[PDB]
């Protein structure tokens, strides 16, 4: 059975980067000629493997992490990145085995009224571990007084929303990213 890689890339909706959905790729034959010879990507760069040698190579499972970041903050999608996205939304482990794919989706993710559906949980106490997911809306306490779930001075809301617009530059347009991980069933 062919791997269902169309379901994860041409999908109408991806989750926000703070709430990135992880998919395990079950037993299936992969077709990576669909993902290298086709070139819709603004960034297509692989870590520890190549863009063409991945065909005659295969792994015990794949994890696909589908999410939305901003185009400059795709530079924060690497091992050893420490940006607001890496520390607080999606941290690719150092020994990350896999390929990172990024494409401009300003046609379906940017609107003239401002798209505030895509959030990014911009405030957190301490950093994230390798592939930690934290969707908690627990009020961001910056001070000694307990926030008790109510906002105020030193009590800021831990989510901040994107403001995606068609009138921003390439560094500020909405970009879809899905990252394929490899771990040591799925061969092709």
């Amino acid at each position, epitope marked *: 059975n062919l791997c269902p890689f169309d379901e994860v890339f041409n999908a109408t909706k991806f989750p926000s980067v703070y709430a990135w959905e992880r998919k395990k790729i079950s037993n299936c034959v992969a077709d990576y000629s669909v993902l290298y010879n086709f070139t819709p990507f603004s960034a297509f760069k692989c870590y520890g493997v190549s863009a063409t040698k991945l065909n005659d190579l295969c792994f015990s499972n794949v994890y696909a992490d589908s999410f939305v970041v901003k185009g*400059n903050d795709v530079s924060q999608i690497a091992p050893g990145q*420490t*940006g*607001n996205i890496a*520390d*607080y939304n999606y941290k690719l482990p150092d020994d990350f085995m896999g390929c990172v794919l990024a494409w401009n989706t300003r046609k379906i993710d940017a609107t003239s009224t401002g798209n505030y559906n895509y959030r990014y949980r*911009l*405030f*957190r*106490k*301490s*950093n994230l571990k390798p592939f930690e997911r934290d969707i908690s809306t627990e009020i*961001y*306490q*910056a*001070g*000694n*007084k307990p926030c008790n779930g109510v906002a105020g*001075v*030193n009590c*800021y809301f831990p989510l*901040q929303s994107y403001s995606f617009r068609p*009138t*921003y*530059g*390439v*560094g*500020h347009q909405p970009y879809r990213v899905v990252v394929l991980s490899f771990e040591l069933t799925v061969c092709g």
Partner: antibody, heavy 119, light 107 residues
């Protein structure tokens, strides 16, 4: 009230450790963006270093590898250790906070201190 | 790094004259650049955050607008208490870079 206090500034030799202390109240340093902004006499402002609330370190190229920004979560204070100080490191150093998340301005401020570097 | 140009570096006008200070960036910076009032012997004070919103406790004489690479500090009525230098700091992307300075004086 919202406040910061800069302290430990003055004269020190090149590569000396005055370790500018920035005591906080009503906000916790373990959970905040906090920045060193300096100004040489008769110059514009410049950036030095910043800490994300997770502890994440950054450095401007004029201060990279020579300075290190740090904090004491128990004492509620920020520290910038300075090493390989120079004649151009004579400036008025402020400890202050850009409101976390980029949208909002730089709410928390101290009055700043002058560090002078001379023979 | 990301360069900027403030224009002018200093200006002088009579009480109530409209003050306009520009800031040009090397690339699109959205809105996260802020404007700052530097008084001699004070901590520098904020003017506008989001490059379009007055901070609470900023005077209503200050206002800001723009997008992309050009920004404009607007003062609609100049006041005697405004004698200061002004800055356009960006925190838009690393490396973070401060503005060149613009001193206003009253004639």
């Amino acid at each position: 009230e919202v406040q910061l206090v800069e302290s430990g500034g003055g004269l020190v030799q090149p590569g000396g450790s005055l370790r500018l202390s920035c005591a906080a109240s009503e906000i916790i340093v373990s959970s905040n963006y906090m920045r060193w902004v300096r100004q040489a006499p008769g110059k514009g402002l410049e950036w030095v270093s910043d800490i994300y609330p997770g502890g994440t370190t950054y450095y401007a190229d004029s201060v990279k590898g020579r300075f290190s920004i740090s904090r004491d979560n128990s004492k509620n204070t920020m520290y910038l250790q300075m090493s390989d100080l120079r004649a151009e490191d004579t400036a008025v150093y402020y400890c202050a906070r850009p409101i976390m998340g980029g949208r909002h301005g730089m709410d928390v401020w101290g009055q700043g201190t002058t560090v002078t570097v001379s023979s | 790094d990301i360069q900027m140009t403030q224009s002018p570096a200093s200006l002088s006008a009579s009480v109530g004259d409209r003050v306009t200070i520009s800031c040009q960036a090397s690339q699109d910076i959205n809105k996260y650049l802020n404007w700052y009032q530097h008084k001699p012997g004070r901590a520098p004070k904020l003017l506008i955050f989001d490059a379009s919103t007055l901070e609470t406790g900023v005077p209503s004489r200050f206002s800001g607008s723009g997008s992309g690479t050009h920004f404009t500090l607007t003062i609609s009525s100049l006041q005697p208490e405004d004698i200061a230098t002004y800055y356009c700091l960006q925190h838009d992307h690393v490396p973070l870079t401060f503005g060149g300075g613009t001193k206003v004086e009253i004639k």
